[PDB]
Design a protein around this ligand. Structure first.
Ligand SMILES: *[C@H](CCCCC)[C@H](O)C/C=C\C/C=C\C/C=C/CCCC(=O)O
Ligand SMILES: *[C@H](CCCCC)[C@H](O)C/C=C\C/C=C\C/C=C\CCCC(=O)O
Lengths: 297, 297
């Protein structure tokens, strides 16, 4: 039973990686692009980009461990542990050439360590809508003159006593609509059906727990990245960020300038956090153009 | 019916103030001291301090509007609105002499405007464990490298669509144990029996909602205080803050110096947010000594 509709010409499949059965959706022909989703979502957030990219690339969109239909990690939820699974998954399909990487929200957290540690394996990189875990996150204000901030969920999700699982269980659909819309500029892209699908997915008890275990490991990821960041990223990089409500604005490119030698960035006016859905057409175009001056079918 | 045991020699009573029935506990003889509790608790947090103060003062400990056994406010939950109720209640019992004030957590928010607008009515002032609402609160971090953000609850409680009531209803006792203990250094004083008492009270639907409405009005209170703070406090003031997990440390005194000409502050080591319970002996001593520098019975 697929949690989300698979687009035509794609297959929903599973691979075992280090004892963890990972789910992904794959299609297309050419060099590999891996698309890594973020919190609240699954591979499905890429379902509009995937058929376009599949015209020139092999496209794979895994579910993060514990989310969607992927088994939880057996090592842990820090960025360095999770990135092992995603790197080895990508290499099962592109063992002989570098692959491209596109990540959104905690997809960044779960890929940056494998990018920095295996730079020869990464052809081009696209990061959108999340800080790389480092000391900058310790500055983000808890509360704003307009009300709730964009980052208080860090502490809510990281709290112990299974605080988030316990308060959200039985209200998963309600809470998902709230945080989607509280980080959105364009809420009308989110149908009741789409919200139902996302909510059913992360409401699985192991997926609800997995969602927050990424945040309970966030400080460990920050400490890990403090060492990894001694090595600057050398591949061509693009950042994308929303310019509207929920968007990260200039922070995305400005942070990446400290990590990457070769980086260009865009801020999308009128768009919030959920770029693949709120601003599908211009985000698809920027990603496709950026990846298509590298190499492709 | 009493939500909490009234100490020997005190009366539990009610008084209508501008159409709102406020509950209070009162005892002793001499000049008046009003003790104003904060979020998650009621008049009862003062129940160990009250018999000692009552040897020298008339002591009144009201329930904040909507909390404990007091009716919700009819005007609103901003600091300036709620302070009217508390000032009028005090002045019912001390119409012709200044009175003393002790306030904890959001009891500060709900008293600071009537202090600065009626400085001749306040003989001495003791504030503990809360910022006065102003622009400084917009810089407190959402997420910390160590420990936990003390202030992320600001956005949780202020989030719209009744987010906090919807998630917490039916789980009030679990949530109260979590946020009390996470803001505590000496957690062992919060026995299940004591947590049961506090949770039964704020689980009343109108009390659970009232609790969060104080935070939904926080931005308004900040705007109110920007004008009010053009006049510094002139009466003798003392600040207390915990030095341990959950405590505000030096911030309490350092902010108060911007508001008061005559202020001394204490940081209590090994004590978190809940000073009357975690550190009863040194806190009671500090308060009694400070208020007994003035006229007492
Ligand atoms: C995923 C967010 C999911 C939203 C639902 C809970 C990650 O947990 C967070 C990624 C992005 C969140 C948005 C804001 C990041 C904060 C940066 C603000 C920078 C300010 C600036 O422009 O300088
Ligand atoms: C009552 C909170 C206690 C109940 C827990 C849910 C008020 O809402 C908050 C009062 C006291 C603690 C919060 C603020 C800390 C004040 C200054 C922060 C100094 C340093 C920093 O953390 O930024």
């Amino acid at each position: 039973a697929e949690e989300f509709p698979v687009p035509n010409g794609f297959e929903s499949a599973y691979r075992e990686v280090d004892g963890v059965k990972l789910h992904y959706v794959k299609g297309g022909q050419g060099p590999l692009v891996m698309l890594v989703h973020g919190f609240g979502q699954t591979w499905y957030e890429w379902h509009q980009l995937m058929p376009e990219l599949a015209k020139r690339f092999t496209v794979i969109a895994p579910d993060l461990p514990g989310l969607g239909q992927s088994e939880p990690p057996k090592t842990g939820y820090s960025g360095e542990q999770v990135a092992v699974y995603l790197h080895k998954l990508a290499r099962q399909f592109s063992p002989d050439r570098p692959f491209d990487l596109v990540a959104h929200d905690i997809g960044i957290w779960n890929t940056y360590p494998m990018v920095v540690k295996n730079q020869a394996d990464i052809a081009r990189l696209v990061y959108m809508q999340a800080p790389i875990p480092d000391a900058r996150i310790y500055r983000f204000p808890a509360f704003t003159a307009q009300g709730e901030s964009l980052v208080w969920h860090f502490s809510f999700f990281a709290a112990d006593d299974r605080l988030a699982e316990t308060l959200i269980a039985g209200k998963e659909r309600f809470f998902l609509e709230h945080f989607i819309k509280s980080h959105a500029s364009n809420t009308e892209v989110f149908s009741e059906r789409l919200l139902d699908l996302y909510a059913r997915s992360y409401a699985k008890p192991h997926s609800l727990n997995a969602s927050f275990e990424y945040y309970r490991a966030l400080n460990e990821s920050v400490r890990q990245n403090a060492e990894l960041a001694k090595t600057r990223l050398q591949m061509p990089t693009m950042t994308l960020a929303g310019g509207g409500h929920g968007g990260m604005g200039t922070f995305q490119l400005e942070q990446m300038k400290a990590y990457a030698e070769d980086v260009e960035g865009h801020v999308l006016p009128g768009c919030g956090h959920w770029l693949p859905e709120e601003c599908a057409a211009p985000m698809n175009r920027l990603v496709i153009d950026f990846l298509s001056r590298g190499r492709h079918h």
